[model samples]
Structures are given as C-alpha cells and as structure tokens.
Target: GSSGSSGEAQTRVKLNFLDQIAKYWELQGSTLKIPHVERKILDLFQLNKLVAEEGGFAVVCKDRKWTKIATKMGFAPGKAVGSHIRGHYERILNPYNLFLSGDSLRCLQKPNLTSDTKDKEY
Candidate 1:
C-alpha cells in the first residue's frame, strides 16, 4: 500500500535568514576605534626593521616605499610625501615607546604657530 506516495513540494520563502543571525551578532557603536593608517605604517616600519636585520643596512628608499604605501592606501598623492610618511610612522612610534617619551608629546605641548605675535611683514 502506497500510503505516502505524494512528493511534498516545499515552498522555500527567500529571506535574509543569515541577517537574522547577524542581528544577534551586532556590536555596540562604542567599540574602541583604532587608527588603521598608522597601523599600516607600523607594519611597514617593522617590515623594514626586519629587512634591515637580514641585510647589512636598510633599503635606499624606505621613506619612498612608505610614501607609496600611503598613497596606495588612499592618502592624497600630493600630500603623501616621504617625510610625511616617516612622520606618520613616528606618530605610532611615539606611543609604542613603552608609553614613555615626550618626543611628539613635547611638541604637542608647545604653543601653536597661530599663537605667534609675528605680523605679515616682509
């Protein structure tokens, strides 16, 4: 006896099923935000440090390499100079220095050029 011979045509309702699962995985907006650009710079800096370790000395255009990486990471080509790239690395280094060192901190504490009393006189 073929009691259950009828094949069931299951109608699958398309939906963002994973989205429901995603809802529970939502994170608070207050999550700590970190600097990616500086982080990238740090990695590149470390890469060179490693290369320097293997090689007798550092590369000729370490700053150039940094500038290229910065520009490729969407930094303005005109603004992303080698000096600026090195400066960005220094920014990460300042804090990475065991939470010590007044290098950039001291400059930060210094008075701004806007506070200067010099007038626009040649």
Candidate 2:
C-alpha cells in the first residue's frame, strides 16, 4: 500500500493533522497527560535542526518524499525501521526541542484533513 506522491491532498492532510493534534493538546489544559502510544518524532527534531539552519520549520516532511523518509524516520519495527513524522507545527521545534502537543505524541495509523478521503488517488 504505497503511492509515491505528496501532492496537494497529501500535504493538506499533514498540515491539517497538525492542527487537529494541536487542538488535542489544548483540550488537555488541566493535567496535560501524555498518550499511551505517540509520534515522539525524534527524527523530525533531528531534521528540523538542519532546516532551521537554513531558515525553516516544517517543510521537508511536507514535501513529496515523506514516504521515502518514512522508513528511516516515521515507522517501524518502531525504530530499527522508523518513527512517526508529521511535522506541520509552529514553534514546534521548541520546548526542550520536542513537539509535546497532546496528540502530537499519539501514533496516527492513518491521519487526514477530513475523514472522508478514505479512497482516493492521494
């Protein structure tokens, strides 16, 4: 199940997912507990370091090659293979250099801008 393309649709989902996950973080205004299984995204932070050096935050992952990087940074065997890397964040490369938004830590088996894009050419 792979389609080598990060067109507008795919890019849209990545960014939108960021907004949703941010909202989730806001929702947890009280205790702000962490999720059970989340996208620690250590990899994104690593990449962001380079991006920042060149003036950027969340662009690389938004590109069309995210799938290619997925194996090395966003999926597994959990690490031997990769880690989750949806980087549509603002001030995301902050706070101890980690994206600690509530749902930011949650693993998205599949995330989207809307729930209806279940079967399309994205």
Candidate 3:
C-alpha cells in the first residue's frame, strides 16, 4: 500500500490477491500450491479492469440519474447504494487490506476496515 527507499535500496510494492495468499502461506510454513493459477491472475486483472470501467460507468450513470431510477424501481435504496459503491471501491483500490490471513481463497470475503460507513455524500 505504501512504498519507500532506505539508504541505497528502493522497494516498490503492489497489493494483489496472490501476494496476500503468499504471505499467509509463508506465515504457516505450508507448501501452498495453486494449480494453473495463471488463470486466476488473469481473472484478477480482468476483474480489476472491469471494476474501473464499471465504476466510470456508474459515475456517469449516477450523473444521468440512473441510481435514482434504480432506487425508485426497488433495485436498491438510495441511502444504501453509497455503501455498496464504497465497498467495491475499497476492494478494487486496496485489495490487500481487504484480504485476511488465511489459506482459503474465500478469505477475501471477510469483513475488514472498509466494512464501515459509505460515500453517501460523494
């Protein structure tokens, strides 16, 4: 999530699903093996890209009043919509923070820092 340089060494870090898994596995000293995980990597990339694209679409749609229409149609309440949007925003932007220390891929779904509040004013 953050990067820094010390003395003559510089380090750059990125947050991703795989990194989360690796860190967990390292902690347990278990030989965590993923079969054909390249597909998962590609899926993560696609998911992130789609999130960005869809987020842009959502912003435009909101500007055009689609969110209001959806609320009127009972798809979602106007007040709760901000929470949903903020949840996805945090997931795509800071997935590592979303991840927890676990061996199962399903660990991604557990609640964390982004679980609270919403961007209702945004």
Candidate 4:
C-alpha cells in the first residue's frame, strides 16, 4: 500500500501582441466565421497596412498573427505556410471598394462590375 501527494505544472511563452488584440475584441474563438470578428480584423489591418519589420515593409508579423488565428480555427499548424491567410483576408475584402464607412453590420456589397469585353472585332 502507498499514499502520495503530487504537483504538476506547465508553462509556455505567450505571443502577447496578438493576445492583446484577441482579448481586446474578445475574439478568442474556435473559428473566424463570425462577421464581427472578421470586420475587426479588417479594421485592424486597414488602420495599419504595414506589419513590423527591420527595414521597409514585410508580412512576417502579419503572417505569424494569421498562423495564430489559423491554429485557433482548428487548422493544422503550418497550414498558413505562405501568404495563405493574407490571401484569404484579401479575398474577403476584394469585393469592397469602400471601407471605413462606419458600418459594422454590412459586408460584401459593391457596385456591380460591367462585363464589357473586347471580343467585338469589326
């Protein structure tokens, strides 16, 4: 027979930059399907289109932040190995010609693009 008391502990480093943003907006969620969060993320980049870098502009900080988001969304780590998340962000924003409209409840509305093609050769 035996009796014992035990203790265990765990520790990990926090990338607090993204953490601050997430906590600020309460965007800690399983996926990015929420329009509110999406809009918040959009507003974030729109305010500052440049990520942190030593010289000039770079996507390193942005990419890492996206990777954090991707993982939180249940994607396998490294799913955003390239510009994957940034591309998705742009894809969502492409239809909009107008931003900073002081509207958070609307999305995906834009003037229809005319399908005029130079196929008529006289």
lDDT of 2 at 85: 36
Worst 10 residues of 2 by lDDT: 81-90
For model 1, residues 8-72, the per-residue Cα lDDT tens digits are 53322212332332343344322222245533433343333543444422352533344444455
Please give the CA lDDT of all the candidate structures: 0.41, 0.42, 0.43, 0.40
| Poorest lDDT segment (10 consecutive residues) of candidate 1 | 12-21
The parts of candidate 4 lying over 4 Å away from their true place are: 1-63, 79-82, 101-122
Looking at model 3, residue 106 earns an lDDT score of 40
lDDT of 2: 0.42
Query: TM-score of predicted model 3?
Result: 0.23
Q: Candidate 3: minimum summed lDDT over ten consecutive residues — where?
A: 35-44
In order of lDDT, best first, we have 3, 2, 1, 4
Task: Please state the error at residue 39 of candidate 4 in Å.
Answer: 23
> Can you tell me which runs of candidate 1 are displaced by over 4 Å?
1-57, 60-63, 79-81, 95-122
Cα misplacement distance, residue 89 of candidate 2 (Å): 3.3
Residue pairs clashing in model 3 are: none
For each candidate in turn, the TM-score is 0.28, 0.24, 0.23, 0.28
In model 1, what is the error at residue 100, expressed in angstroms? 13
Best model per lDDT: 3
Two-way TM-score contest, 3 vs 4, winner: 4
Score residue 90 of candidate 2 by CA lDDT. 26
